[PDB]
């Protein structure tokens, strides 16, 4: 389980991962500072307004951590946490527990609530425009700010991904199954999708809400908001995370490496990152695309595909 988390990028710029260690990384390749945070990180590090740096950690605590990577203030659990925290419209931060709980944590650290489910919670919340939380695991719930479920919608036997939410409230996941479900804001199907395929990734969205998701076997799916396929890309290697949506709508994602591939369907380059797979790409305000490797490699890339630089922990 000791492996990379995916990158994140704070306002600033600085680019955070958790691995050993929580990294902070400059924009221009060099180490900022590093965080013990117990032992191994592989979630998403969050990054609030105030710059304060939110990591979960399979030590089951969620740490604040200050810019200058001095510790806040941390937050107990009794399990593990492979659930990455997200920030709400108001500063609360959410994490989903091996305990079976969602957490809503304030931004001293005290706990606001916990909603309970009876089922590990693996993946990110997220947060709708009017401060509802959602999160899947073994069914969609949505939760209102102050912890009570709004509804649940129930997607069949098996694990279903971090939900997307559209402009319009749509939520999008998918499950294990190869389904890609649009629930409505108030809880009923709009419709779904089906692929015969293992699903692992989350759905993304972008251009012109095109929904995005890859399956186990290597296809990048682009659906359109009807529910019908817009087109499928075909890789020969595993795709496991979500992809990443750039300004210009070209897709990113990683899997044996980087690809980038544009709106109409047609690769516009591919990154060679490593031996080992790569973990969701992180988009920079300037263009530049960040990758980690699962043995602790960070990728900077520039918008053409060639490398801008690499760190190693």
Do not use: C
């Not at 399990?79 to 001293?108: Q, W």
């Not at 402009?167 to 890609?180: A, M, Q, R, W």
Request: hydrophobic share 30%; no cysteine; aromatic share 16%.
């Amino acid at each position: 389980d000791a492996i990379t988390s995916a990158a994140s990028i704070g306002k600033d710029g600085t680019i955070y991962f958790g691995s050993d260690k929580v990294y902070a990384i400059n924009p221009d390749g060099t180490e900022k500072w590093n965080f013990y945070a117990g032992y191994w990180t592989v979630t998403r590090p969050a990054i609030s307004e105030d710059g304060t740096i939110y990591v979960t950690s399979l030590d089951g605590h969620l740490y604040a951590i200050n810019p200058d990577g001095t510790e806040k203030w941390r937050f107990k659990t009794e399990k593990r946490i492979e659930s990455s925290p997200v920030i709400g419209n108001t500063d609360t931060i959410y994490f989903g527990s091996y305990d079976g709980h969602l957490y809503a944590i304030n931004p001293d650290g005290t706990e606001k609530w916990r909603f309970k489910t009876n089922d590990a919670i693996t993946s990110a919340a997220s947060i709708g425009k009017d401060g509802t939380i959602y999160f899947g695991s073994d069914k969609v719930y949505a939760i209102n700010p102050d912890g009570t479920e709004k509804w649940n919608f129930y997607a069949g036997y098996w694990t279903v991904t971090r939900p997307a939410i559209s402009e319009d409230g749509t939520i999008y996941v998918t499950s294990l199954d190869g389904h890609l479900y649009a629930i409505n804001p108030d809880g009923t199907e709009k419709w779904r999708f089906k692929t015969e395929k293992r699903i692992e990734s989350s759905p993304v969205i972008g251009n012109t809400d095109t929904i995005y998701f890859g399956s186990y076997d290597g296809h990048l799916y682009a659906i359109n908001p009807d529910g019908t396929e817009k087109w499928r890309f075909k890789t020969n290697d595993a795709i496991t995370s979500a992809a990443s949506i750039g300004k210009d709508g070209t897709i990113y994602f990683g899997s044996d490496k980087v690809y980038a591939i544009n709106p109409d369907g047609t690769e516009k380059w591919n990154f060679y990152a490593g031996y080992w797979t790569v973990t969701r790409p992180a988009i920079s305000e300037d263009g530049t695309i960040y990758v980690t490797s699962l043995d602790g490699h960070l990728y900077a890339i520039n918008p053409d595909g060639t490398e801008k630089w690499r760190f190693k922990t």
